[PDB]
């Protein structure tokens, strides 16, 4: 009954068995609360040391994720429902678009290796692999789509593959996994005095569901039945640092906007309906028909109501009153017949959809949402809004980035180029840099330079006695001593 993983994943499982075998020998012991900040959801289990076969593992992985897996699914759809609305989608677009760009005859996001290495051959090998990592994401064509989905859901996962007979060269295109069917946990099976203070590996378990039982749109499947336990080594993933007030109940970048997104939509509809309902003239015609049951009294009503009836409809394709003859009566001249000598038969009129706005709340709320969706609010030179925006974009890029770093460091180990130890003790820095808009970058720099130049021109009358030139260059032009020397050297050369 002690079943293993479908064998196709076994090579990844093996990598993890080794990873945990050594983590288990680590001295991160004598710890009260588990040494965990984010990602996979933790859970206290059966305290049985190594008893983690498929059945047992499923029981607790499932029990751990279950009370909230529904919520997780609802959030995915909630965020998507927002993404499907207008004046939401455009905020996401602005962010995704700037986070990942491609440009005219330029490079794309790329690995920057500028730190010490045993031999430079590694820089080429890493760069070559990196390029292939992008090929396995097809980032150059859909990188911005991966990002968009990631951003909206605040997570993305991919399934990695191997040969598996020659796993070292089995590295190939990744398959993006929709979180809808992905579960992730950290399980604890050791115990000591008053709780578990033992170094814990947690095993980073993933589970991939089966039938498309849950859904956002119809066309769903029958019961999933069992689910598949998957090693973390097999999954490329990234996620945000945004979590709700409990556990690892991770939330979307648009989570903040859910309230006002929906609120604005209600307000918008309230306005639309308000002005439509009651727009036409409204009234109830009354006929006094004494000593009759409705089955007969109705004839008296018919003699009036089907005589005075204005059989009129409006052609919304052509702005006309359908078959209206004559074109327009000068008076809606109506009559009512009073059988008794009493002023009782009448028409009961109603108010219409009057234009009384004062349509102000809609702006209050539009603006709140607009900002809830992630400013700059300048969209309908260099400012604080742009500067904080750029910082935000870098922060997003640095989380998204794992999507490259994971398969990169993996592939460079799996193909046996760098050891795990070497990678871990070397970086310390494996930053992947993005291409940024040169239009804006040039403008930013030019404005900065103008100010620097203008200041040099202020120092001028005093620089001969008060300010060294090195000082003017390092303080006003913000030049480095080496940069200063290099220009000075070039300047003498320029003479010829």
């Amino acid at each position: 009954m002690k079943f293993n993983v479908l064998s196709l994943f076994a090579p990844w499982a093996k990598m993890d068995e080794r990873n945990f075998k050594d983590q288990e020998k680590e001295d991160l012991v004598s710890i009260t609360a588990p040494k965990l900040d984010d990602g996979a959801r933790e859970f206290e289990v059966s305290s049985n040391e190594a008893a983690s076969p498929y059945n047992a593992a499923f029981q607790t992985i499932f029990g751990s994720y279950e009370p909230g897996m529904k919520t997780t699914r609802e959030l995915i759809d909630t965020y998507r429902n927002l993404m499907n609305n207008y004046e939401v989608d455009n905020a996401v677009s602005e962010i995704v678009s700037d986070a990942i760009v491609y440009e005219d005859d330029t490079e794309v996001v790329a690995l920057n290796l500028d730190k010490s290495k045993f031999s430079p051959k590694i820089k080429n090998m890493m760069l070559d692999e990196f390029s292939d990592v992008l090929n396995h994401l097809s980032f150059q064509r859909k990188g911005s789509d991966h990002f968009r989905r990631w951003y909206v859901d605040s997570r993305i996962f991919f399934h990695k593959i191997i040969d598996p007979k020659r796993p070292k060269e089995g590295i190939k295109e990744l398959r993006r996994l929709d979180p809808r069917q992905v579960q992730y946990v950290r399980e604890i099976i050791t115990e000591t005095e008053a709780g578990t203070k033992i170094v814990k590996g947690y095993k980073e378990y993933f589970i991939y569901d089966t039938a498309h039982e849950s859904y956002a749109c119809d066309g769903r499947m029958y019961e999933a039945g069992t689910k598949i336990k998957i090693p973390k080594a097999a999954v490329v993933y990234a996620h945000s640092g945004l979590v709700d007030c409990c556990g690892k109940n991770i939330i979307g970048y648009l989570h903040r906007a859910v309230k006002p997104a929906n609120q604005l939509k209600l307000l918008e509809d309230a306005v639309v309906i308000y002005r439509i309902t009651r727009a036409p003239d409204r009234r109830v015609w009354y006929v006094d028909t004494g000593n009759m049951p409705a089955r007969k009294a109705a004839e008296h009503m018919q003699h009036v109501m089907n005589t005075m009836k204005n059989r009129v409809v409006y052609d919304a394709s052509t702005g006309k009153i359908k078959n209206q003859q004559h074109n327009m009566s000068m008076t809606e001249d109506y009559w009512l017949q009073r059988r008794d000598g009493k002023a009782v038969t009448e028409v009961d009129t109603l108010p219409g959809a009057d234009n009384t706005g004062n349509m102000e709340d809609i702006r209050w709320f539009r603006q709140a949402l607009y900002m809830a969706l992630r400013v700059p609010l300048s969209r309908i030179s260099i400012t604080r809004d742009e500067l904080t925006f750029a910082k935000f974009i870098r922060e997003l890029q640095h989380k998204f980035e794992e999507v490259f770093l994971d398969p990169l460091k993996t592939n460079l180990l799996l193909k046996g180029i760098i050891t795990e130890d070497e990678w871990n003790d070397e970086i310390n820095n494996i930053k992947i840099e993005f291409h940024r808009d040169s239009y804006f970058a040039e403008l930013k720099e030019a404005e900065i330079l103008e100010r620097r130049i203008n200041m040099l021109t202020m120092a001028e009358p005093f620089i001969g006695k008060y300010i060294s030139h090195r000082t003017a260059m390092k303080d006003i032009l913000q030049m480095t001593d080496e940069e200063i020397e290099q220009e000075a050297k070039q300047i003498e050369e320029e003479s010829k």
């Binding site: 059966s46 305290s47 049985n48 008893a51």
Partner: protein, 52 residues
């Protein structure tokens, strides 16, 4: 409460636990009524057994 430092605990990981123990015995049949033990904190050894 005096919880459990005056007893063993040996917490279970399953219902139904078990324990085995060894005794040193003799008389050509380690398991018999009348079989005798070699070691016991309350009783002196059978001093003539390996002897006369």
């Amino acid at each position: 409460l005096i919880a459990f430092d005056i007893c063993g605990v040996q917490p279970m990981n399953s219902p139904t636990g078990q324990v085995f123990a060894l005794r040193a015995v003799y008389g050509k049949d380690p398991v018999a009524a009348g079989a005798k033990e070699a070691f016991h904190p309350m009783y002196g050894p059978d001093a003539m057994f390996s002897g006369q």
